[PDB]
mmCIF file with all atom_site columns, C-alpha atoms in Angstrom:
data_model
loop_
_atom_site.group_PDB
_atom_site.id
_atom_site.type_symbol
_atom_site.label_atom_id
_atom_site.label_alt_id
_atom_site.label_comp_id
_atom_site.label_asym_id
_atom_site.label_entity_id
_atom_site.label_seq_id
_atom_site.pdbx_PDB_ins_code
_atom_site.Cartn_x
_atom_site.Cartn_y
_atom_site.Cartn_z
_atom_site.occupancy
_atom_site.B_iso_or_equiv
_atom_site.pdbx_formal_charge
_atom_site.auth_seq_id
_atom_site.auth_comp_id
_atom_site.auth_asym_id
_atom_site.auth_atom_id
_atom_site.pdbx_PDB_model_num
ATOM 1   C CA . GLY A 1 1  ? 0.047   0.083   0.194   1.00 0.00 ? 1  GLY A CA 1
ATOM 2   C CA . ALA A 1 2  ? 2.943   2.485   -0.395  1.00 0.00 ? 2  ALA A CA 1
ATOM 3   C CA . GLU A 1 3  ? 2.480   5.594   -2.185  1.00 0.00 ? 3  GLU A CA 1
ATOM 4   C CA . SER A 1 4  ? 3.495   6.056   -6.270  1.00 0.00 ? 4  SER A CA 1
ATOM 5   C CA . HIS A 1 5  ? 6.369   7.806   -4.884  1.00 0.00 ? 5  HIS A CA 1
ATOM 6   C CA . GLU A 1 6  ? 7.721   4.744   -3.188  1.00 0.00 ? 6  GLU A CA 1
ATOM 7   C CA . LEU A 1 7  ? 7.201   2.647   -6.611  1.00 0.00 ? 7  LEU A CA 1
ATOM 8   C CA . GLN A 1 8  ? 9.126   5.421   -8.563  1.00 0.00 ? 8  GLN A CA 1
ATOM 9   C CA . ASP A 1 9  ? 11.887  5.261   -6.280  1.00 0.00 ? 9  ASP A CA 1
ATOM 10  C CA . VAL A 1 10 ? 11.978  1.394   -6.379  1.00 0.00 ? 10 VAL A CA 1
ATOM 11  C CA . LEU A 1 11 ? 12.100  1.620   -10.299 1.00 0.00 ? 11 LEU A CA 1
ATOM 12  C CA . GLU A 1 12 ? 14.886  3.919   -10.236 1.00 0.00 ? 12 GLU A CA 1
ATOM 13  C CA . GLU A 1 13 ? 16.999  1.541   -8.784  1.00 0.00 ? 13 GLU A CA 1
ATOM 14  C CA . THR A 1 14 ? 19.271  -0.511  -11.057 1.00 0.00 ? 14 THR A CA 1
ATOM 15  C CA . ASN A 1 15 ? 21.066  -2.873  -9.225  1.00 0.00 ? 15 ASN A CA 1
ATOM 16  C CA . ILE A 1 16 ? 18.629  -5.983  -8.529  1.00 0.00 ? 16 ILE A CA 1
ATOM 17  C CA . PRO A 1 17 ? 19.856  -6.146  -5.064  1.00 0.00 ? 17 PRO A CA 1
ATOM 18  C CA . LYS A 1 18 ? 18.961  -2.663  -4.163  1.00 0.00 ? 18 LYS A CA 1
ATOM 19  C CA . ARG A 1 19 ? 15.572  -2.802  -5.592  1.00 0.00 ? 19 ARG A CA 1
ATOM 20  C CA . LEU A 1 20 ? 14.716  -6.041  -3.692  1.00 0.00 ? 20 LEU A CA 1
ATOM 21  C CA . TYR A 1 21 ? 15.764  -4.810  -0.709  1.00 0.00 ? 21 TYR A CA 1
ATOM 22  C CA . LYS A 1 22 ? 13.819  -1.330  -1.326  1.00 0.00 ? 22 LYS A CA 1
ATOM 23  C CA . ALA A 1 23 ? 10.996  -3.873  -2.026  1.00 0.00 ? 23 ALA A CA 1
ATOM 24  C CA . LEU A 1 24 ? 11.560  -5.591  1.462   1.00 0.00 ? 24 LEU A CA 1
ATOM 25  C CA . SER A 1 25 ? 11.829  -2.373  2.912   1.00 0.00 ? 25 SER A CA 1
ATOM 26  C CA . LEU A 1 26 ? 8.447   -1.191  1.752   1.00 0.00 ? 26 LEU A CA 1
ATOM 27  C CA . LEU A 1 27 ? 6.851   -4.879  2.644   1.00 0.00 ? 27 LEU A CA 1
ATOM 28  C CA . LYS A 1 28 ? 7.910   -4.096  5.971   1.00 0.00 ? 28 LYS A CA 1
ATOM 29  C CA . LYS A 1 29 ? 6.642   -0.818  6.329   1.00 0.00 ? 29 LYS A CA 1
ATOM 30  C CA . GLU A 1 30 ? 3.137   -1.718  5.009   1.00 0.00 ? 30 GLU A CA 1
ATOM 31  C CA . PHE A 1 31 ? 3.537   -4.580  7.475   1.00 0.00 ? 31 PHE A CA 1
ATOM 32  C CA . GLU A 1 32 ? 4.110   -2.052  10.304  1.00 0.00 ? 32 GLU A CA 1
ATOM 33  C CA . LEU A 1 33 ? 1.405   0.366   9.355   1.00 0.00 ? 33 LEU A CA 1
ATOM 34  C CA . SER A 1 34 ? -0.957  -2.970  9.095   1.00 0.00 ? 34 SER A CA 1
ATOM 35  C CA . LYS A 1 35 ? 0.286   -3.963  12.430  1.00 0.00 ? 35 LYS A CA 1
ATOM 36  C CA . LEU A 1 36 ? -0.596  -0.533  13.946  1.00 0.00 ? 36 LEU A CA 1
ATOM 37  C CA . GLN A 1 37 ? -3.827  0.010   12.519  1.00 0.00 ? 37 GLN A CA 1
ATOM 38  C CA . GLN A 1 38 ? -4.692  -3.768  13.931  1.00 0.00 ? 38 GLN A CA 1
ATOM 39  C CA . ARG A 1 39 ? -3.314  -2.854  17.471  1.00 0.00 ? 39 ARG A CA 1
ATOM 40  C CA . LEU A 1 40 ? -5.251  0.351   17.521  1.00 0.00 ? 40 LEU A CA 1
ATOM 41  C CA . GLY A 1 41 ? -8.410  -1.463  16.509  1.00 0.00 ? 41 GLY A CA 1
ATOM 42  C CA . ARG A 1 42 ? -8.110  -4.696  18.638  1.00 0.00 ? 42 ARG A CA 1
ATOM 43  C CA . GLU A 1 43 ? -7.567  -2.122  21.517  1.00 0.00 ? 43 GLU A CA 1
ATOM 44  C CA . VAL A 1 44 ? -10.723 -0.200  20.671  1.00 0.00 ? 44 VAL A CA 1
ATOM 45  C CA . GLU A 1 45 ? -12.539 -3.354  20.524  1.00 0.00 ? 45 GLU A CA 1
ATOM 46  C CA . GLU A 1 46 ? -11.211 -4.419  23.846  1.00 0.00 ? 46 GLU A CA 1
ATOM 47  C CA . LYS A 1 47 ? -12.359 -1.673  25.640  1.00 0.00 ? 47 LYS A CA 1
ATOM 48  C CA . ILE A 1 48 ? -15.639 -1.004  24.283  1.00 0.00 ? 48 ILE A CA 1
ATOM 49  C CA . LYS A 1 49 ? -16.169 -4.494  25.448  1.00 0.00 ? 49 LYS A CA 1
ATOM 50  C CA . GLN A 1 50 ? -14.888 -3.790  28.363  1.00 0.00 ? 50 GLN A CA 1
ATOM 51  C CA . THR A 1 51 ? -17.684 -1.032  28.573  1.00 0.00 ? 51 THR A CA 1
ATOM 52  C CA . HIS A 1 52 ? -20.231 -3.086  27.722  1.00 0.00 ? 52 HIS A CA 1
ATOM 53  C CA . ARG A 1 53 ? -19.286 -5.444  30.549  1.00 0.00 ? 53 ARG A CA 1
ATOM 54  C CA . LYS A 1 54 ? -19.113 -2.498  32.738  1.00 0.00 ? 54 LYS A CA 1
ATOM 55  C CA . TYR A 1 55 ? -22.970 -2.168  31.809  1.00 0.00 ? 55 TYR A CA 1
ATOM 56  C CA . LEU A 1 56 ? -23.433 -5.885  32.546  1.00 0.00 ? 56 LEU A CA 1
ATOM 57  C CA . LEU A 1 57 ? -21.696 -5.816  35.902  1.00 0.00 ? 57 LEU A CA 1
ATOM 58  C CA . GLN A 1 58 ? -24.142 -3.107  36.692  1.00 0.00 ? 58 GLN A CA 1
ATOM 59  C CA . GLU A 1 59 ? -26.987 -5.304  35.875  1.00 0.00 ? 59 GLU A CA 1
ATOM 60  C CA . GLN A 1 60 ? -25.485 -8.233  37.862  1.00 0.00 ? 60 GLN A CA 1
ATOM 61  C CA . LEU A 1 61 ? -25.278 -5.821  40.815  1.00 0.00 ? 61 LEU A CA 1
ATOM 62  C CA . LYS A 1 62 ? -28.885 -4.784  40.273  1.00 0.00 ? 62 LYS A CA 1
ATOM 63  C CA . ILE B 2 1  ? -19.017 -11.878 44.634  1.00 0.00 ? 1  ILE B CA 1
ATOM 64  C CA . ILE B 2 2  ? -19.503 -8.076  43.995  1.00 0.00 ? 2  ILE B CA 1
ATOM 65  C CA . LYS B 2 3  ? -15.679 -7.762  45.335  1.00 0.00 ? 3  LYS B CA 1
ATOM 66  C CA . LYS B 2 4  ? -13.877 -7.461  41.778  1.00 0.00 ? 4  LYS B CA 1
ATOM 67  C CA . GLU B 2 5  ? -11.730 -5.112  40.141  1.00 0.00 ? 5  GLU B CA 1
ATOM 68  C CA . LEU B 2 6  ? -14.679 -3.257  39.068  1.00 0.00 ? 6  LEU B CA 1
ATOM 69  C CA . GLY B 2 7  ? -13.420 -0.798  36.737  1.00 0.00 ? 7  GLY B CA 1
ATOM 70  C CA . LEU B 2 8  ? -16.516 1.276   37.390  1.00 0.00 ? 8  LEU B CA 1
ATOM 71  C CA . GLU B 2 9  ? -15.592 1.269   41.299  1.00 0.00 ? 9  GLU B CA 1
ATOM 72  C CA . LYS B 2 10 ? -12.297 2.499   40.573  1.00 0.00 ? 10 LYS B CA 1
ATOM 73  C CA . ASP B 2 11 ? -13.444 5.641   38.981  1.00 0.00 ? 11 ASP B CA 1
ATOM 74  C CA . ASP B 2 12 ? -13.697 7.169   42.264  1.00 0.00 ? 12 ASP B CA 1
ATOM 75  C CA . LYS B 2 13 ? -17.505 6.525   42.263  1.00 0.00 ? 13 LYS B CA 1
ATOM 76  C CA . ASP B 2 14 ? -16.581 4.559   45.480  1.00 0.00 ? 14 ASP B CA 1
ATOM 77  C CA . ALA B 2 15 ? -14.888 7.751   46.780  1.00 0.00 ? 15 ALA B CA 1
ATOM 78  C CA . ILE B 2 16 ? -18.455 9.456   45.864  1.00 0.00 ? 16 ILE B CA 1
ATOM 79  C CA . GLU B 2 17 ? -20.240 6.642   47.580  1.00 0.00 ? 17 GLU B CA 1
ATOM 80  C CA . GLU B 2 18 ? -18.083 5.022   50.807  1.00 0.00 ? 18 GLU B CA 1
ATOM 81  C CA . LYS B 2 19 ? -15.738 8.440   51.280  1.00 0.00 ? 19 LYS B CA 1
ATOM 82  C CA . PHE B 2 20 ? -18.654 10.716  51.337  1.00 0.00 ? 20 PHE B CA 1
ATOM 83  C CA . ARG B 2 21 ? -20.768 8.283   53.695  1.00 0.00 ? 21 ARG B CA 1
ATOM 84  C CA . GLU B 2 22 ? -17.945 8.148   56.284  1.00 0.00 ? 22 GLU B CA 1
ATOM 85  C CA . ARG B 2 23 ? -17.249 12.378  55.793  1.00 0.00 ? 23 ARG B CA 1
ATOM 86  C CA . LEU B 2 24 ? -21.195 12.320  56.597  1.00 0.00 ? 24 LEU B CA 1
ATOM 87  C CA . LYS B 2 25 ? -20.593 10.083  59.303  1.00 0.00 ? 25 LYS B CA 1
ATOM 88  C CA . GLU B 2 26 ? -19.431 12.965  61.860  1.00 0.00 ? 26 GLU B CA 1
ATOM 89  C CA . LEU B 2 27 ? -22.167 15.163  60.900  1.00 0.00 ? 27 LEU B CA 1
ATOM 90  C CA . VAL B 2 28 ? -25.254 15.737  62.835  1.00 0.00 ? 28 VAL B CA 1
ATOM 91  C CA . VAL B 2 29 ? -27.495 16.145  59.998  1.00 0.00 ? 29 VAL B CA 1
ATOM 92  C CA . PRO B 2 30 ? -31.357 16.194  58.850  1.00 0.00 ? 30 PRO B CA 1
ATOM 93  C CA . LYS B 2 31 ? -33.272 13.834  57.330  1.00 0.00 ? 31 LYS B CA 1
ATOM 94  C CA . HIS B 2 32 ? -34.030 16.013  53.959  1.00 0.00 ? 32 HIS B CA 1
ATOM 95  C CA . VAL B 2 33 ? -30.376 15.790  52.808  1.00 0.00 ? 33 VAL B CA 1
ATOM 96  C CA . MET B 2 34 ? -30.420 12.012  53.802  1.00 0.00 ? 34 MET B CA 1
ATOM 97  C CA . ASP B 2 35 ? -32.770 11.368  51.382  1.00 0.00 ? 35 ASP B CA 1
ATOM 98  C CA . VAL B 2 36 ? -31.666 13.709  48.786  1.00 0.00 ? 36 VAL B CA 1
ATOM 99  C CA . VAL B 2 37 ? -27.981 12.519  48.751  1.00 0.00 ? 37 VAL B CA 1
ATOM 100 C CA . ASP B 2 38 ? -29.293 8.914   48.811  1.00 0.00 ? 38 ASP B CA 1
ATOM 101 C CA . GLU B 2 39 ? -31.434 9.277   45.819  1.00 0.00 ? 39 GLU B CA 1
ATOM 102 C CA . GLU B 2 40 ? -28.430 11.359  44.011  1.00 0.00 ? 40 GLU B CA 1
ATOM 103 C CA . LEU B 2 41 ? -26.222 8.211   44.847  1.00 0.00 ? 41 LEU B CA 1
ATOM 104 C CA . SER B 2 42 ? -28.617 5.212   43.647  1.00 0.00 ? 42 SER B CA 1
ATOM 105 C CA . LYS B 2 43 ? -29.086 7.585   40.463  1.00 0.00 ? 43 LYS B CA 1
ATOM 106 C CA . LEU B 2 44 ? -25.145 7.809   40.068  1.00 0.00 ? 44 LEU B CA 1
ATOM 107 C CA . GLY B 2 45 ? -24.449 4.075   40.949  1.00 0.00 ? 45 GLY B CA 1
ATOM 108 C CA . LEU B 2 46 ? -27.258 2.799   38.651  1.00 0.00 ? 46 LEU B CA 1
ATOM 109 C CA . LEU B 2 47 ? -25.577 4.593   35.676  1.00 0.00 ? 47 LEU B CA 1
ATOM 110 C CA . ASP B 2 48 ? -22.221 4.973   34.254  1.00 0.00 ? 48 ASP B CA 1
ATOM 111 C CA . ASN B 2 49 ? -19.446 7.550   35.566  1.00 0.00 ? 49 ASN B CA 1
ATOM 112 C CA . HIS B 2 50 ? -17.589 8.810   32.797  1.00 0.00 ? 50 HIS B CA 1
ATOM 113 C CA . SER B 2 51 ? -20.056 11.187  31.237  1.00 0.00 ? 51 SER B CA 1
ATOM 114 C CA . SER B 2 52 ? -20.037 15.069  31.765  1.00 0.00 ? 52 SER B CA 1
ATOM 115 C CA . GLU B 2 53 ? -23.243 14.952  33.890  1.00 0.00 ? 53 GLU B CA 1
ATOM 116 C CA . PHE B 2 54 ? -21.736 12.386  36.121  1.00 0.00 ? 54 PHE B CA 1
ATOM 117 C CA . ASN B 2 55 ? -18.912 15.382  36.316  1.00 0.00 ? 55 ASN B CA 1
ATOM 118 C CA . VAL B 2 56 ? -21.741 17.900  37.274  1.00 0.00 ? 56 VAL B CA 1
ATOM 119 C CA . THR B 2 57 ? -23.227 15.312  39.626  1.00 0.00 ? 57 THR B CA 1
ATOM 120 C CA . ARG B 2 58 ? -19.802 14.646  41.530  1.00 0.00 ? 58 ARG B CA 1
ATOM 121 C CA . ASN B 2 59 ? -19.272 18.398  41.562  1.00 0.00 ? 59 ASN B CA 1
ATOM 122 C CA . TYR B 2 60 ? -22.527 19.000  43.087  1.00 0.00 ? 60 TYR B CA 1
ATOM 123 C CA . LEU B 2 61 ? -21.766 15.911  46.091  1.00 0.00 ? 61 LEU B CA 1
ATOM 124 C CA . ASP B 2 62 ? -18.565 17.189  46.582  1.00 0.00 ? 62 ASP B CA 1
#
């Protein structure tokens, strides 16, 4: 999911090792972005479920 | 069984219920405020803690 500028920079690379290493770096960057999004989400669902559980515990107390 | 982590209890609402109760203990105080505070505390406990109206209730109780 990297920006088109990254693709242009990869194309500009001539040596095969350079292009492959830059592609690997872009893969790692996309992996990091996806993992950050997944972590932020997962914690958000965890805490919203904990809020619904707060209400559930209030009902149990009632 | 009520005794748990009770994140709701961790939000000072116990300091609105028990701490204020003990503060009121040493107060030779009439019954009108007794019923008023009991009703307000029941409303506070029956509901959540975070929202702004609960901050208003907390300041009023303080």
